[PDB]
Design an enzyme around this catalytic site. Structure first.
Site, PDB file in Angstrom:
ATOM      1  N   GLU A 129       0.817  -1.206   0.000  1.00 38.09           N
ATOM      2  CA  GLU A 129       0.000   0.000   0.000  1.00 38.09           C
ATOM      3  C   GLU A 129       0.851   1.257   0.000  1.00 38.09           C
ATOM      4  O   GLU A 129       1.761   1.406   0.820  1.00 38.09           O
ATOM      5  CB  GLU A 129      -0.925   0.017   1.217  1.00 38.09           C
ATOM      6  CG  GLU A 129      -1.887   1.193   1.209  1.00 38.09           C
ATOM      7  CD  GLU A 129      -2.706   1.305   2.488  1.00 38.09           C
ATOM      8  OE1 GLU A 129      -2.386   0.610   3.476  1.00 38.09           O
ATOM      9  OE2 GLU A 129      -3.659   2.111   2.513  1.00 38.09           O
ATOM     10  N   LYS A 185      -9.180   2.557  -3.758  1.00 40.50           N
ATOM     11  CA  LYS A 185      -9.759   2.141  -2.491  1.00 40.50           C
ATOM     12  C   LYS A 185     -11.159   2.716  -2.328  1.00 40.50           C
ATOM     13  O   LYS A 185     -11.384   3.910  -2.545  1.00 40.50           O
ATOM     14  CB  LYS A 185      -8.865   2.588  -1.334  1.00 40.50           C
ATOM     15  CG  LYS A 185      -9.310   2.063   0.028  1.00 40.50           C
ATOM     16  CD  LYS A 185      -8.359   2.529   1.114  1.00 40.50           C
ATOM     17  CE  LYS A 185      -8.436   1.621   2.335  1.00 40.50           C
ATOM     18  NZ  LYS A 185      -7.479   2.051   3.387  1.00 40.50           N
ATOM     19  N   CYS A 202      -5.743  -2.849   2.317  1.00 44.94           N
ATOM     20  CA  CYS A 202      -5.654  -2.711   3.762  1.00 44.94           C
ATOM     21  C   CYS A 202      -6.920  -3.192   4.463  1.00 44.94           C
ATOM     22  O   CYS A 202      -7.314  -4.356   4.341  1.00 44.94           O
ATOM     23  CB  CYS A 202      -5.384  -1.244   4.109  1.00 44.94           C
ATOM     24  SG  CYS A 202      -4.446  -0.966   5.612  1.00 44.94           S
TER      25      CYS A 202
HETATM   26  C1  LIG Z   1     -17.969   8.439  16.134  1.00 45.38           C
HETATM   27  C2  LIG Z   1     -18.069   6.939  16.395  1.00 45.38           C
HETATM   28  C3  LIG Z   1     -16.910   6.177  15.762  1.00 45.38           C
HETATM   29  C4  LIG Z   1     -17.155   5.883  14.284  1.00 45.38           C
HETATM   30  C5  LIG Z   1     -17.619   4.452  14.034  1.00 45.38           C
HETATM   31  C6  LIG Z   1     -16.488   3.640  13.413  1.00 45.38           C
HETATM   32 SE1  LIG Z   1     -15.324   3.118  14.889  1.00 45.38          SE
HETATM   33  C7  LIG Z   1     -13.614   3.790  14.256  1.00 45.38           C
HETATM   34  C8  LIG Z   1     -12.742   2.615  13.848  1.00 45.38           C
HETATM   35  C9  LIG Z   1     -11.509   2.469  14.729  1.00 45.38           C
HETATM   36  C10 LIG Z   1     -10.321   3.217  14.142  1.00 45.38           C
HETATM   37  C11 LIG Z   1      -9.698   2.485  12.961  1.00 45.38           C
HETATM   38  C12 LIG Z   1      -8.652   1.468  13.390  1.00 45.38           C
HETATM   39  C13 LIG Z   1      -7.509   1.437  12.392  1.00 45.38           C
HETATM   40  C14 LIG Z   1      -7.606   0.244  11.458  1.00 45.38           C
HETATM   41  O1  LIG Z   1      -8.530  -0.490  11.514  1.00 45.38           O
HETATM   42  O2  LIG Z   1      -6.594   0.026  10.531  1.00 45.38           O
HETATM   43  C15 LIG Z   1      -6.649  -1.226   9.924  1.00 45.38           C
HETATM   44  C16 LIG Z   1      -5.721  -1.096   8.734  1.00 45.38           C
HETATM   45  O3  LIG Z   1      -5.645   0.267   8.416  1.00 45.38           O
HETATM   46  C17 LIG Z   1      -4.318  -1.585   9.076  1.00 45.38           C
HETATM   47  O4  LIG Z   1      -3.398  -0.589   8.717  1.00 45.38           O
HETATM   48  C1  LIG Z   2     -18.110   9.133  19.755  1.00 46.85           C
HETATM   49  C2  LIG Z   2     -16.640   8.933  19.392  1.00 46.85           C
HETATM   50  C3  LIG Z   2     -16.175   7.494  19.604  1.00 46.85           C
HETATM   51  C4  LIG Z   2     -15.047   7.103  18.652  1.00 46.85           C
HETATM   52  C5  LIG Z   2     -13.669   7.579  19.105  1.00 46.85           C
HETATM   53  C6  LIG Z   2     -12.615   7.337  18.027  1.00 46.85           C
HETATM   54 SE1  LIG Z   2     -10.827   7.551  18.773  1.00 46.85          SE
HETATM   55  C7  LIG Z   2      -9.846   7.765  17.102  1.00 46.85           C
HETATM   56  C8  LIG Z   2      -8.882   6.595  16.913  1.00 46.85           C
HETATM   57  C9  LIG Z   2      -7.851   6.896  15.832  1.00 46.85           C
HETATM   58  C10 LIG Z   2      -7.358   5.633  15.136  1.00 46.85           C
HETATM   59  C11 LIG Z   2      -6.448   5.957  13.955  1.00 46.85           C
HETATM   60  C12 LIG Z   2      -6.453   4.817  12.944  1.00 46.85           C
HETATM   61  C13 LIG Z   2      -5.859   5.201  11.596  1.00 46.85           C
HETATM   62  C14 LIG Z   2      -4.336   5.142  11.556  1.00 46.85           C
HETATM   63  O1  LIG Z   2      -3.723   4.956  12.548  1.00 46.85           O
HETATM   64  O2  LIG Z   2      -3.665   5.299  10.342  1.00 46.85           O
HETATM   65  C15 LIG Z   2      -4.448   4.928   9.247  1.00 46.85           C
HETATM   66  C16 LIG Z   2      -3.889   5.582   7.993  1.00 46.85           C
HETATM   67  O3  LIG Z   2      -4.128   6.959   8.079  1.00 46.85           O
HETATM   68  C17 LIG Z   2      -4.573   5.041   6.742  1.00 46.85           C
HETATM   69  O4  LIG Z   2      -5.017   3.741   7.034  1.00 46.85           O
END
Ligand SMILES: CCCCCC[Se]CCCCCCCC(=O)OC[C@@H](O)CO
Ligand SMILES: CCCCCC[Se]CCCCCCCC(=O)OC[C@H](O)CO
Ligand SMILES: CCCCCCCC/C=C\CCCCCCCC(=O)OC[C@H](O)CO
Ligand SMILES: CCCCCCCC/C=C\CCCCCCCC(=O)OC[C@H](O)CO
Ligand SMILES: CCCCCCCC/C=C\CCCCCCCC(=O)OC[C@H](O)CO
Ligand SMILES: CCCCCCCC/C=C\CCCCCCCC(=O)OC[C@H](O)CO
Ligand SMILES: *[Se@H](CCCCCC)CCCCCCCC(=O)OC[C@@H](O)CO
Ligand SMILES: CCCCCC[Se]CCCCCCCC(=O)OC[C@@H](O)CO
Ligand SMILES: CCCCCC[Se]CCCCCCCC(=O)OC[C@@H](O)CO
Ligand SMILES: CCCCCC[Se]CCCCCCCC(=O)OC[C@@H](O)CO
Ligand SMILES: CCCCCC[Se]CCCCCCCC(=O)OC[C@@H](O)CO
Ligand SMILES: CCCCCC[Se]CCCCCCCC(=O)OC[C@@H](O)CO
Ligand SMILES: CCCCCC[Se]CCCCCCCC(=O)OC[C@@H](O)CO
Ligand SMILES: CCCCCC[Se]CCCCCCCC(=O)OC[C@@H](O)CO
Ligand SMILES: CCCCCC[Se]CCCCCCCC(=O)OC[C@@H](O)CO
Ligand SMILES: CCCCCC[Se]CCCCCCCC(=O)OC[C@@H](O)CO
Ligand SMILES: CCCCCC[Se]CCCCCCCC(=O)OC[C@@H](O)CO
Ligand SMILES: CCCCCC[Se]CCCCCCCC(=O)OC[C@@H](O)CO
Ligand SMILES: CCCCCC[Se]CCCCCCCC(=O)OC[C@H](O)CO
Length: 510
Positions: free
Chosen positions: A267, A335, A387
């Site tokens: 990626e 994507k 990803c």
């Molecule tokens: C406002 C309420 C929250 C919104 C609902 C969706 Se929850 C956010 C997801 C949790 C944050 C994403 C976790 C990162 C990930 O899954 O990366 C996998 C891949 O990129 C490996 O590189």
């Molecule tokens: C009501 C609110 C509840 C939800 C709280 C969410 Se906390 C945010 C976590 C943040 C997680 C970051 C995951 C993405 C990352 O780490 O890099 C991904 C890259 O940019 C491309 O895949």
């Protein structure tokens, strides 16, 4: 006395629920203790027995908080490394995410207790798996969703794996919830009958693991290479680090030309705009073609649209034999499902007109279409997913074609360092290969890079955190699994039939 009050007995269930939820994390890679899934779900089913619905909802929330708080707190690694926020805020954001996801398990337990208050096999074996299917769907759909930690993925190397090519991983989710409920009912009622049913229901799918829904095509075996560049994460724009990155990937690729039919870079391997790298791509394309090799690689493509704006895509491009590189080629993948909080922020469009322009990100990613044709390279059809997209089983199946030769996913999991997150991600990727009976080529920046066989088995792999090329022979497969033919509508039909029967009987006490 005080330890026996009603409020204290409920607080003890909340503590137990937290622990049984955290136990569930052990079911997933890198721990791979698949009985932990059943233990975890038994706790959820048993601890919600004989509760008022709000009490059960609190128990389901705390169970979720144990599971998600222990199972996805690896997102902290990225927040703390790149977010620039103070330590306590970083912890709070992780706690916030875990609590958000636990709303769905609280929803499950509250509704289950509301509509099926009595401790019966109908509650645990009919209502519960149907309701769980629904609440887990909502967790994977609301705000674009986060369907992480579904216990069916813990059966990739387990007794129930044969169910996945038939009805998909969510059918394993369903059966696990059903089997664990019957075990909870047997324990609490101290009754051997639900236990016997549970073991019978659990053991019946075992011989299915020996079905090969596919046939191999050894006449099309090729040598494939996957270059794990192990590029550390960049912060500012630097053409010098860009050139060192191109240097690493090119120099690793040059001796593979004419020997590997297919070479893959992960990626965003090329960390520049596609429009800015036309000389390099054209020169690389000719070298690959002159030796009979093809390259598939991630890149960023800011593409000027007819409205004279730039759609910025997270992209896979193709080069070389059977895939002549061109900026106008359709042999590319954009994507579709951006990573929440990584590539966009949920609800950011509703809020954009309020934001100061200087505070908005420089640009944002656009989305490719939900279904895109396979990539073609060296006569090979590759169904691609970038990803996170590999965890979206229905979407991968909807993009799959009968003439797909391999599944392809490229990913950069370096954001999460040495945590269990990359392992959970990799475990979910393997399920796609099993579900669709195609080998999966997984190319990553620093791990986990592997070839998965058509039954989810790890055929080849290189270690994380190394600059290395994985080179192996791979054989395509053909044939349609039942799940490839249907998608998950059969599981939804079963969910509706269980849900209809369970709700009907629940209403029958009127
Ligand atoms: C406002 C309420 C929250 C919104 C609902 C969706 Se929850 C956010 C997801 C949790 C944050 C994403 C976790 C990162 C990930 O899954 O990366 C996998 C891949 O990129 C490996 O590189
Ligand atoms: C009501 C609110 C509840 C939800 C709280 C969410 Se906390 C945010 C976590 C943040 C997680 C970051 C995951 C993405 C990352 O780490 O890099 C991904 C890259 O940019 C491309 O895949
Ligand atoms: C009853 C269940 C909990 C109730 C709800 C409150 C949420 C917990 C909040 C803080 C606990 C401390 C978190 C664990 C200690 C901090 C971890 C840490 O500091 O991580 C830094 C390190 O770099 C990592 O790799
Ligand atoms: C040990 C720390 C003390 C804890 C005391 C025992 C647990 C309290 C009972 C239920 C959980 C609280 C209610 C949880 C649901 C309320 C809403 C919420 O907290 O979640 C919002 C979510 O984060 C939106 O994104
Ligand atoms: C330790 C408490 C003792 C109580 C006795 C019963 C414990 C409940 C059973 C298992 C909990 C273990 C949870 C699984 C461990 C998760 C590891 C972890 O959170 O890793 C952080 C990050 O997500 C990855 O890098
Ligand atoms: C009245 C009886 C009780 C009510 C029902 C009991 C539960 C049935 C359980 C699973 C359904 C089994 C059949 C569905 C699984 C296979 C579906 C499938 O995907 O196969 C179709 C595809 O065309 C193949 O090539
Ligand atoms: Se469930 C474990 C209970 C075990 C022992 C009980 C005596 C505890 C779950 C912790 C709840 C975290 C709350 C998350 C939060 O603060 O959300 C913030 C949100 O309101 C902002 O919108
Ligand atoms: C209430 C009962 C819950 C489930 C019943 C299953 Se029987 C328990 C023994 C089952 C033995 C199966 C092997 C376990 C395993 O997953 O090995 C881990 C290894 O792969 C890497 O840690
Ligand atoms: C790996 C994490 C394990 C944590 C140790 C918990 Se030991 C308690 C075992 C017993 C399992 C849960 C307790 C049963 C219960 O109290 O529910 C019945 C009730 O609903 C009827 O009204
Ligand atoms: C009841 C639910 C409320 C949820 C919110 C509580 Se989050 C707990 C924060 C816990 C704070 C831990 C300390 C982290 C740290 O690293 O502090 C040093 C830092 O200032 C240097 O960056
Ligand atoms: C207010 C709104 C809430 C509605 C309550 C009942 Se939601 C009924 C589910 C509707 C089912 C649609 C499922 C389509 C699909 O295939 O999604 C994959 C899925 O299996 C899982 O990811
Ligand atoms: C680590 C494992 C955690 C929990 C797993 C155990 Se499942 C509990 C089943 C409970 C077993 C049923 C007992 C039936 C009974 O005792 O009554 C029949 C009697 O009359 C005959 O003499
Ligand atoms: C992938 C999804 C597969 C779905 C298969 C449904 Se088969 C119907 C099982 C029937 C449901 C549970 C029956 C257990 C029971 O009867 O025990 C209680 C009784 O012994 C108390 O006297
Ligand atoms: C009563 C049903 C009648 C017909 C059933 C078909 Se054969 C039953 C064996 C069913 C086998 C399921 C349990 C296997 C296990 O315990 O896991 C192995 C572990 O090594 C993985 O790590
Ligand atoms: C029970 C509810 C609590 C919710 C808040 C938990 Se915050 C714990 C953060 C823990 C973050 C994961 C640790 C992974 C790791 O140690 O890797 C770091 C290394 O790779 C860096 O490059
Ligand atoms: C309690 C019972 C639950 C069983 C669920 C998992 Se087995 C479902 C059928 C498993 C077999 C699916 C059939 C695939 C197929 O396409 O064969 C038909 C074709 O030959 C006709 O022309
Ligand atoms: C009352 C039983 C409840 C359990 C549910 C069993 Se659903 C029976 C499946 C019957 C198999 C029909 C297969 C249809 C097909 O393959 O069409 C392709 C189409 O799905 C492409 O979208
Ligand atoms: C209390 C809860 C009980 C359950 C009641 C809700 Se049943 C949801 C019906 C949902 C009806 C069809 C869902 C869409 C679908 O089947 O997509 C198939 C496609 O993805 C490819 O197979
Ligand atoms: C005591 C506070 C609990 C704190 C955590 C609950 Se998260 C539940 C999210 C969703 C909320 C709905 C679940 C509850 C339910 O369904 O109970 C039936 C009826 O609606 C209400 O008595």
């Amino acid at each position: 006395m005080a330890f026996a009050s009603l409020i204290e007995r409920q607080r003890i269930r909340l503590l137990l629920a937290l622990l049984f939820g955290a136990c569930g994390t052990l079911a997933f890679s890198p721990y791979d203790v698949w009985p932990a899934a059943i233990i975890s779900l038994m706790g959820l089913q048993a601890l919600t027995f004989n509760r008022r619905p709000l009490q059960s909802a609190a128990i389901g929330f705390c169970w979720g908080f144990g599971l998600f708080g222990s199972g996805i707190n690896w997102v902290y690694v990225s927040i703390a490394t790149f977010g620039g926020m103070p330590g306590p805020v970083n912890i709070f954001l992780v706690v916030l995410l875990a609590a958000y996801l636990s709303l769905y398990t609280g929803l499950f337990a509250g509704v289950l207790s509301r509509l099926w208050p009595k401790t019966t096999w109908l509650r645990v074996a009919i209502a519960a798996p149907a309701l769980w299917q629904v609440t887990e769907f909502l967790r994977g759909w609301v705000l674009t969703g986060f369907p992480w930690l579904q216990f069916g993925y813990s059966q990739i190397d387990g007794p129930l794996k044969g169910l996945a090519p038939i009805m998909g991983v969510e059918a394993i989710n369903f059966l696990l919830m059903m089997v664990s409920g019957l075990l909870a009912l047997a324990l609490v009622k101290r009754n051997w009958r639900p236990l016997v049913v549970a073991v019978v229901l659990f053991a019946l799918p075992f011989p299915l693991r020996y079905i090969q829904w596919f046939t191999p095509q050894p006449e099309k075996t090729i040598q494939v290479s996957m270059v794990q560049g192990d590029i550390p994460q960049s912060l500012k724009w630097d053409e010098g680090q860009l050139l060192n990155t191109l240097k690493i990937y090119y120099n690793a690729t040059a001796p593979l030309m004419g020997k590997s039919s297919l070479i893959i870079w992960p990626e965003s391997a090329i960390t520049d705009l596609e429009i800015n790298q036309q000389p390099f791509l054209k020169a690389l394309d000719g070298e690959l073609r002159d030796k009979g090799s093809s390259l598939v690689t991630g890149i960023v493509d800011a593409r000027l649209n007819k409205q004279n704006r730039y759609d910025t895509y997270n992209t896979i491009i193709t080069l070389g034999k059977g895939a002549p590189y061109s900026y106008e080629s359709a042999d590319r993948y954009n994507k579709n499902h951006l990573v929440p909080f990584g590539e966009f922020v949920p609800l950011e469009s509703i809020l954009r007109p309020l934001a100061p322009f200087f505070d908005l990100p420089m640009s944002s990613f656009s989305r490719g279409p939900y279904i895109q044709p396979p990539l073609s390279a060296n006569g090979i059809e590759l169904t691609a997913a970038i990803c996170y997209e590999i965890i979206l089983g229905e979407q991968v199946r909807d993009n799959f074609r009968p003439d797909t030769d391999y599944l392809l996913t490229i990913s950069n999991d370096a954001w999460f360092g040495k945590s269990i997150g990359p392992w959970q991600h990799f475990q979910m990727a393997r399920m796609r290969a099993l579900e669709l009976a195609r080998p999966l080529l997984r190319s990553t920046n620093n791990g986990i890079t592997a070839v998965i066989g058509p039954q989810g088995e790890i055929q080849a792999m290189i270690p994380q955190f190394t600059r290395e090329v994985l080179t192996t022979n791979v054989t395509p497969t053909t044939g349609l699994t039942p799940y490839a033919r249907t998608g998950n509508w059969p599981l939804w039909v079963l969910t509706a039939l269980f849900g209809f029967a369970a709700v009907l009987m629940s209403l029958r006490q009127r």
